Amino acid sequence: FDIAKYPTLALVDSTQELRLLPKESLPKLCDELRRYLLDSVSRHFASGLGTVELTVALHYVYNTPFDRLIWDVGHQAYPHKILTGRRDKIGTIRQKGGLHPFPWRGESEYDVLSVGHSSTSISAGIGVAIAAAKEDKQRRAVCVIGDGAITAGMAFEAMNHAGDIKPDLLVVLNDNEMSISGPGTLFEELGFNYIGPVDGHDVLGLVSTLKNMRDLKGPQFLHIMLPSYSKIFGDWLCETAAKDNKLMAITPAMREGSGMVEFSKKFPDRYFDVAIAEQHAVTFAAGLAIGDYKPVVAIYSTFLQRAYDQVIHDVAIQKLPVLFAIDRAGIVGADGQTHQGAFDLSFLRCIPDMVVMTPSDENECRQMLYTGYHYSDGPCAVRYPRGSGTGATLEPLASLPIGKGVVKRQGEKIAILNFGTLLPEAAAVADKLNATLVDMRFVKPLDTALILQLAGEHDALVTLEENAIMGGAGSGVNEVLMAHRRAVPVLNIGLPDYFIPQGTQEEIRADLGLDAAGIEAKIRDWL
Amino acid sequence: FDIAKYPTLALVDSTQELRLLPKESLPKLCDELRRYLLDSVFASGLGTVELTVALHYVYNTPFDRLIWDVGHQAYPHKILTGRRDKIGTIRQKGGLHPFPWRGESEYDVLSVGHSSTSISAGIGVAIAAAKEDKQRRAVCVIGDGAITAGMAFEAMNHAGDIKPDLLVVLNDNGGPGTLFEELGFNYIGPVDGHDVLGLVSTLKNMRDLKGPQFLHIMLPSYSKIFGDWLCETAAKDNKLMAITPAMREGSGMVEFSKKFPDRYFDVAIAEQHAVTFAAGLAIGDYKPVVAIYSTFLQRAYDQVIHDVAIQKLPVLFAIDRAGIVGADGQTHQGAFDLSFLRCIPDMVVMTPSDENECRQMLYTGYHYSDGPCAVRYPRGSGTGATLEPLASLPIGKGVVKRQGEKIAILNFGTLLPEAAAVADKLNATLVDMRFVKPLDTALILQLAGEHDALVTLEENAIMGGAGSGVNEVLMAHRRAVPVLNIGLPDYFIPQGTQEEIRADLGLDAAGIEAKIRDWL
Ligand SMILES: Cc1ncc(C[n+]2csc(CCOP(=O)(O)OP(=O)(O)O)c2C)c(N)n1
Numbered sequence A: 001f002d003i004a005k006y007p008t009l010a011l012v013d014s015t016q017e018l019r020l021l022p023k024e025s026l027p028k029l030c031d032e033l034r035r036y037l038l039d040s041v042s043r044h045f046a047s048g049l050g051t052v053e054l055t056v057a058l059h060y061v062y063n064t065p066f067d068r069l070i071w072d073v074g075h076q077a078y079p080h081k082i083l084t085g086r087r088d089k090i091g092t093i094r095q096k097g098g099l100h101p102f103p104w105r106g107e108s109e110y111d112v113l114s115v116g117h118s119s120t121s122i123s124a125g126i127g128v129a130i131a132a133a134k135e136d137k138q139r140r141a142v143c144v145i146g147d148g149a150i151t152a153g154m155a156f157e158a159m160n161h162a163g164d165i166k167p168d169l170l171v172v173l174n175d176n177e178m179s180i181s182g183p184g185t186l187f188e189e190l191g192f193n194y195i196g197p198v199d200g201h202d203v204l205g206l207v208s209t210l211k212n213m214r215d216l217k218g219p220q221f222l223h224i225m226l227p228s229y230s231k232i233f234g235d236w237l238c239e240t241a242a243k244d245n246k247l248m249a250i251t252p253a254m255r256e257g258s259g260m261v262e263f264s265k266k267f268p269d270r271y272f273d274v275a276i277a278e279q280h281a282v283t284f285a286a287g288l289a290i291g292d293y294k295p296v297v298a299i300y301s302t303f304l305q306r307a308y309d310q311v312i313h314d315v316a317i318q319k320l321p322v323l324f325a326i327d328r329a330g331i332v333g334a335d336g337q338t339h340q341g342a343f344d345l346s347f348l349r350c351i352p353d354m355v356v357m358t359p360s361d362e363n364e365c366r367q368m369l370y371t372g373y374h375y376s377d378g379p380c381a382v383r384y385p386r387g388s389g390t391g392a393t394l395e396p397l398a399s400l401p402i403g404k405g406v407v408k409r410q411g412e413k414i415a416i417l418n419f420g421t422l423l424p425e426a427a428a429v430a431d432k433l434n435a436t437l438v439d440m441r442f443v444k445p446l447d448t449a450l451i452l453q454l455a456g457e458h459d460a461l462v463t464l465e466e467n468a469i470m471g472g473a474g475s476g477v478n479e480v481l482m483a484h485r486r487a488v489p490v491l492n493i494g495l496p497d498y499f500i501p502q503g504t505q506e507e508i509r510a511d512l513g514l515d516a517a518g519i520e521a522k523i524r525d526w527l
Numbered sequence B: 001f002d003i004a005k006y007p008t009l010a011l012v013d014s015t016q017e018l019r020l021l022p023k024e025s026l027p028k029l030c031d032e033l034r035r036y037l038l039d040s041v042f043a044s045g046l047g048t049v050e051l052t053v054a055l056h057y058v059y060n061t062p063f064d065r066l067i068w069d070v071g072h073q074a075y076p077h078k079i080l081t082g083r084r085d086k087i088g089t090i091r092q093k094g095g096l097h098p099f100p101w102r103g104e105s106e107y108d109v110l111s112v113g114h115s116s117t118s119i120s121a122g123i124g125v126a127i128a129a130a131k132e133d134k135q136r137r138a139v140c141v142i143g144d145g146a147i148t149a150g151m152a153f154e155a156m157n158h159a160g161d162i163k164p165d166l167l168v169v170l171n172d173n174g175g176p177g178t179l180f181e182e183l184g185f186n187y188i189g190p191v192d193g194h195d196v197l198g199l200v201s202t203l204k205n206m207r208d209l210k211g212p213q214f215l216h217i218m219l220p221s222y223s224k225i226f227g228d229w230l231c232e233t234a235a236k237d238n239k240l241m242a243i244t245p246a247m248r249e250g251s252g253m254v255e256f257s258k259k260f261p262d263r264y265f266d267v268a269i270a271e272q273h274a275v276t277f278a279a280g281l282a283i284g285d286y287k288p289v290v291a292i293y294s295t296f297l298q299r300a301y302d303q304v305i306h307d308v309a310i311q312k313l314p315v316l317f318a319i320d321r322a323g324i325v326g327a328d329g330q331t332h333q334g335a336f337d338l339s340f341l342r343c344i345p346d347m348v349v350m351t352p353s354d355e356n357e358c359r360q361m362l363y364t365g366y367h368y369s370d371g372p373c374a375v376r377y378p379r380g381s382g383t384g385a386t387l388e389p390l391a392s393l394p395i396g397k398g399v400v401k402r403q404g405e406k407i408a409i410l411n412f413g414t415l416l417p418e419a420a421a422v423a424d425k426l427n428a429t430l431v432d433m434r435f436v437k438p439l440d441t442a443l444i445l446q447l448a449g450e451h452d453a454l455v456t457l458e459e460n461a462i463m464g465g466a467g468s469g470v471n472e473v474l475m476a477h478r479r480a481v482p483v484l485n486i487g488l489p490d491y492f493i494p495q496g497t498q499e500e501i502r503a504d505l506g507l508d509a510a511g512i513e514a515k516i517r518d519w520l
């Protein structure tokens, strides 16, 4: 740290020291903190730059870490980490072993809530504030939420509840944060005292306003002013819409991530961004299907968690033919635990009347989208990872036989049953071990006849998937075998029973034993 | 039927004769329909008589799409859409569904049961209708409780953005309109919801308006065991807090709400906020208990995963209506919580087999500080088990109930009396497993080494369920002992009494014995 470059930032290693600075020094501190961020974080974080003055004001006014400051998701919280003891580590953000992208409870007493999904801050802040009142030590609570995050249903539920029971909570609406990857009437109607919009870049103005609002009772609201699978999906949307008036596609505020930018411009009448609203995304699709359109819900595995009840109740129970294009399935890399696509094979396959498909390459991905798009008896899901595929030829489209796998190699003694994009690693292993290899294609319905044939011809089976082992695709294979009283041992390879930490997709797969070398070692150790 | 008592209603078994009535007969029609409901079948259905008459009189149903949010507000709808001769079978095995059900009538646009789905679906129907370009109209009816749900706000906010031709009727049982105006609706009301002629005139106008329109009209059960336990714990522990998403009576919380009002939080129909609010209380070093039905917990799954499990916060989930729920049918079954909770890291999942176990497990999860715990139990009465003094149960350990030979039955939950009869008949070993997660791995492997076959029993989907986790342990240890997994089949379970639906699915002693004998 170059104390001569940042002589004011040099004085405030702790927020206790920050609170001792003369107020007159705070604009210079904000300049230095903005320069230090630019000089220090690797190439993205415009909302971090835009929240510098707010962050200084908040830690200057609130007695953190005793008073509780809860950040909603976003790079708005980078300056926060710099001021709470992690200045010299800020260049490690998102690296394996480095700082978390967002506040993480285990990382600092100053991180009240681990975030990553959006819109959780107000709800948690109401709990913290109710607890603070009962504790009766005059602890205060503030949360900072971006304008994207405030579109989610659970933020409305939280604000409505705050209007009812009237916690002593300050909510700061930060228009600098987008929350992904006049103005006060609504919040007043929900029961808040509303101030603003104020200048979010006036550190002294914010200190004065926050000092007053921190002392008020009840709910307070301050308003401050080579191809990726995603590209494969977006290309397929465009090809399909060009020939079929029925296709409609929906994203809950993840147009760029899900690969839909070109589609949104070529087919604007087929494209719906419903904001950060996964639950509405799904039930809106159910309504389009009742209307005899063919909706595709583009949604990340991790965010689909939040729309589970709409998948079960508003789609599967109705047998409506909605197609789910599930991106960021499996290991997602840099965003770490809060974002992994770790559970969708488990939580979707226990639901009746769901078809669940796991392509092993980008051709299979297209074939499965096509198959699910023309499958009319009920909903279909196709899940695929962040990142590139194998370079597979994109073959002419044809519906795949439902619930049938594909034999890739005939070997002996061991059969490997692959679900999804780890197939090239399993192919290397099966050559090395002279094993049988099968690309299962379908997690549900499973190819039971192929499972029984494999079990009748090998001493042991291996299942492979980029999902939790517990309840996952391989667990489904186990169930078929046991139902047929064929107790042939199966090694279920997949994600272990802990939340998967950050790193490159490649290095985290290797750490989990999900490359060819890891898979081979697991088989040998188990045999 | 009884033409004498209802001489206007008698002539309008379908909406086509309904629309042939002169306006002047609709008031008498409404009186007759209300009396018919009183005689043939709750309060919310009585309350929607006039609205229902007005809607079907003005809208060209079933071509125009009318969507009902959940509630017995839809009983009159079924009487006017050709099903009045069946209204006496509602909620019975083989009878009419309690709520509109797509397969039951072309007048049922959306199957409902969970709340707050009507606006979202209505926006899709309305967007489809505009693209169809055949002048089809769309209208939905939502209750004042259902509009508290986060997905209803998401839908209203999207309606304000894309401006579909949809009428939302708030069936409400400054000013109230400002919120809906700010979300982007044209707001009318509040109006008299029992002036049928006034509603016909208003609906006629608003059906013809473009864009988003908003019309505002004016032995103890396990639940009791849980509520009693909350009271006893809060009496001696200031940290206890209990949360319900608007299901106070069903979750057994009435007395608790009256004795501990300062520790009781009804968050409205807001499962998502219920869970993350609990996470905040736990961060604040209180001990929250979230009371929630299995089927509704589906809607808070992301908050369980991201705001509780990833945080390692020690929230207690008291999961009622687990397993087969009986009369409410498919939309309400507690069919999946053992599957969707056990794949989540750092979750403890407990399945008590009687009232005493239920209390022991609530106490155990309440005093477990390393992460969240869930205790799931069915609707209905327990066995009469003696309530023993409370102490924490050793984590991930099951109990041997009977020693036999050849077969071992591994029970998760309240079908244990049935497993016990079977175990006697077959001279099978019987184990009460207690924990779905973590499993008693040591015991599973000992049972497999001592028997030719295992049987698992749970009142949850077989797919992904507790017995599926036993399979996984055996496979991980490269064992070769087959396991019969007994549980809920892979279809949504229809309505009936709990006893008769369990019998149908083979989850009584007789059906379990038969499944074992057939499989061997
Ligand atoms: C997600 C969800 N949570 C809880 C329920 C339980 N529930 C059924 S009806 C109701 C209240 C709404 O009905 P009401 O206000 O009594 O009058 P109505 O709309 O029938 O006229 C609730 C909370 C539900 N159906 N869905």
Ligand SMILES: [Mg+2]
Pocket: B044, B142, B143, B144, B145, B171, B172, B173
């Ligand atoms: Mg109501």
